[PDB]
């Protein structure tokens with residue numbers, strides 16, 4: 150019932166009580182662990198609503214008060230009649246901050262309480278969506294001093310009337326399939342990039358082409374829009390000691406802003422809810438640049454360092470990997486754009502976990518995702534046992550709209 | 557029910573039916589994943605089911621399932637249990653047994669070698685001094701003058717749990733650590749307590765930064781006994797760097813043979829509480845964990861100082877830079893001295909190949925991602941990108957409490 154988690158580096162032990170408030174399923178059984186798997190009505194709505202309002206009135210310290218009881222009935226009476234209900238602004242902010250608090254795969258939650266929430270529930274069209282997105286991008290970019298933000302479009306109704314941002318992020322680079330068999334740009338976005346050319350985008354067909362936004366209002370055909378270029382802050386990638394680095398021609402955008410997720414608060418489903426913070430260095434250095442199936446620039450870099458690529462055991466991939474990541478951190482900082490290195494991100498996440506243990510009774514955390522994809526064991530999160538569980542409100546993945554939407 | 561795992565780099569999907577043959581619990585529930593928790597005397601009743609299962613396995617694999625010789629062995633194990641409360645494994649069964657304990661070992665990235673294990677049967681051993689002698693032969697044979705060979709040495713199974721063979725050392729070769737009275741620690745900090753025990757049992761400690769520990773051996777439930785391993789048997793590699801000449805002045809070395817001596821080997825219900833096994837090292841085990849963990853030799857700072865890195869801001873990635881050099885030095889030193897070692901790239905690649913094969917030939921490969929992915933350069937090794945299913949098959953290697961914690965002292 151109570152569970153202890155030990156840090157095997159500091160011997161510090163914490164007791165988890167928060168997992169018993171967990172509702173949804175993990176994918177794991179007594180017989181099988183599924184921790185490394187990337188993805189494992191009116192009758193239904195009212196309990197969900199009640200469970201959420203109960204934690205909301207508790208957090209504001211008015212559990213079981215007349216204000217509590219009255220909102221509880223008001224929501225019940227709106228469900229029986231309208232087959233859905235509306236959140237109050239205050240409940241919406243709480244909902245969203247907490248969906249971030251509960252994101253077990255996010256290393257950056259020490260920040261959770263300072264989320265800026267933009268309520269876009271009065272939006273009705275794709276142009277309106279575009280306007281909200283641009284105000285989001287600009288607010289959160291803040292000339293390089295980035296701020297956490299989420300913009301919340303109207304909730305799902307019959308399911309035929311969904312708002313959706315088809316992009317997986319607001320700002321991403323195009324992917325094109327070429328005559329050779331090679332890929333130009335970002336291979337992760339090839340399918341989406343084709344969906345842009347078939348909606349009518351003029352692709353410049355380079356390596357770092359900022360994709361257009363494809364916006365869906367109230368279930369309608371989606372629509373193309375270019376983000377004003379002046380709003381997409383980008384950093385050219387150079388190295389502090391290696392002068393040749395600049396001619397690789399690398400740049401990355403400043404703003405990571407996830408836009409394909411679904412926000413569930415008290416049974417209500419917000420299918421367009423883009424949110425953004427700022428990068429941990431390794432996300433770009435290790436994953437975007439180095440993954441075999443992304444930009445995969447490791448061979449090129451190691452060749453420019455004049456390292457021995459004859460045998461795997463020179464650790465030349467490892468040597469290059471560090472420099473590539475040195476250069477991302479250096480470039481961002483020298484341009485005064487917010488970024489965090491993996492040592493700092495994880496040290497901070499450990500502070501946060503210790504905070505959540507004494508102040509909430511626990512902290513759901515998915516180790517497989519928290520441990521950075523380089524230098525695992527030299528970060529303190531490597532030695533830290535974590536319990537993974539699913540709390541609500543939450544962010545969830547959702548089918549890609551193009552498989553699903555009807556034209 | 558069939559379960560699919562995806563490789564997110566190659567988009568290869570594989571199908572696991574083997575998980576269906578799993579009986580032990582994982583520590584996980586529908587409501588909670590404990591995949592990163594380090595650790596989450598039998599009666600006659602329980603024993604025959606386990607015996608039967610195992611012997612069914614054994615005989616399936618030799619293609620003799622349901623043969624006269626299979627039924628006759630079942631009946632014979634049956635009788636032996638009801639009459640003696642335990643049973644003896646045939647030699648061939650034990651070999652098969654120990655090989656599968658490896659093959660089922662889901663935290664081991666080194667299973668591609670699983671069949672080529674050399675089994676030493678020390679089940680006639682009755683005394684500590686007998687145990688020293690079997691262990692010495694293990695080590696010499698396994699060391700092979702640097703051309704390491706995997707091997708395990710199986711001492712007599714548990715009987716009533718009052719007569720256990722234990723190897724008190726966590727590994728056969730390991731360095732003393734000594735808590736000084738100023739809170740500092742000389743040698744290996746992981747081995748402090750056990751070192752103290754050795755000292756209590758009469759070991760006269762040199763007190764250097766790398767003193768090979770003495771074997772502490774328990775036979776047949778008896779109080780355990782000290783023995784120095786012959787130093788000519790302990791292969792060690794001094795650590796240098798191919799380009800940094802100052803590296804050798806750090807005074808580092810490591811032993812060449814990793815030999816785990818604290819696990820329990822379970823086969824068809826029988827428990828072997830002393831079963832040291834050994835392989836060869838993946839470079840990162842020494843380089844990342846043994847030298848660079850804060851709770852071990854902790855040399856990152858000393859190494860960064862000497863490279864004159866920018867140590868004033870963690871954003872220089874001075875730690876990441878120092879770590880790669882140290883790992884380079886470990887691999888270089890081993891290769892140059894002709895002692896077997898594998899780098900993490902080549903090991904993880906081998907393991908992906910094994911895993912794929914195991915799905916085609918066995919219908920599964922239980923693997924634990926938290927353990928399989930190396931503690932440096934995770935995502936540039938192909939395992940990071942591989943979905944894995946973790947489950948418990950028997951035969952298996954299990955953990956067991958440390959003996960100083962359970963052992964009944966006699967004087």
Ligand code: HEM
Nearest residue numbers: 249252254255256257260297298424425426427428429544
């Ligand atoms: C402000 C600094 C932030 C940092 C450094 C950060 C970092 C990360 C990292 C490293 C991941 C792992 C995913 C990967 O590497 O592919 C992640 C996932 C995630 N982040 Fe955070 N994040 C930040 C802000 C936010 C905000 C503001 C939200 C929402 C309010 C958020 C929600 C999530 C969610 C839901 C996931 C899981 C994504 C998935 O399951 O695919 N993050 N984040």
Ligand code: HEM
Nearest residue numbers: 658661663664665666706707708833834835836837838953
């Ligand atoms: C020969 C080359 C081998 C290599 C490179 C290798 C590699 C590894 C590594 C890197 C680990 C993770 C342990 C850690 O990092 O703390 C491990 C664990 C393990 N290995 Fe292997 N191994 C090899 C051979 C063997 C042999 C001979 C056996 C047994 C007969 C074996 C069985 C195991 C088991 C049972 C574990 C689980 C350890 C634990 O849970 O603490 N492997 N191995």
Ligand SMILES: Cc1cc(N)nc(C[C@H]2CNC[C@@H]2NCCNCCc2cccc(F)c2)c1
Nearest residue numbers: 187188405406407424425426427428429432546
């Ligand atoms: C808001 C925020 C800040 C920061 N720093 N970082 C983030 C994570 C995103 C950035 N960099 C990757 C990650 N993206 C989140 C979405 N993950 C895709 C995993 C995936 C792929 C395919 C199929 C699946 F089912 C799942 C968010």
Ligand SMILES: Cc1cc(N)nc(C[C@H]2CNC[C@@H]2NCCNCCc2cccc(F)c2)c1
Nearest residue numbers: 594595814815816833834835836837838841955
């Ligand atoms: C046979 C073989 C070959 C290789 N290369 N490598 C190995 C693993 C050992 C060497 N490098 C470290 C590792 N360790 C052996 C297993 N014990 C640690 C697990 C553990 C720790 C604390 C509490 C627990 F409950 C469990 C075995």
Ligand SMILES: C[C@H](O)[C@H](O)[C@H]1CNc2nc(N)[nH]c(=O)c2N1
Nearest residue numbers: 185186187517518940941942943
């Ligand atoms: C197979 C495995 O689940 C998959 O590669 C995961 C591993 N850990 C990860 N961790 C983070 N932070 N991001 C990822 O995309 C992944 N991918």
Ligand SMILES: C[C@H](O)[C@H](O)[C@H]1CNc2nc(N)[nH]c(=O)c2N1
Nearest residue numbers: 157531532533534592594926927
């Ligand atoms: C808490 C966490 O599971 C623990 O520190 C584990 C993580 N993965 C590991 N993986 C290996 N190979 N060896 C280890 O000691 C550990 N430690």
Ligand SMILES: [Zn+2]
Nearest residue numbers: 177182584589
């Ligand atoms: Zn699990």
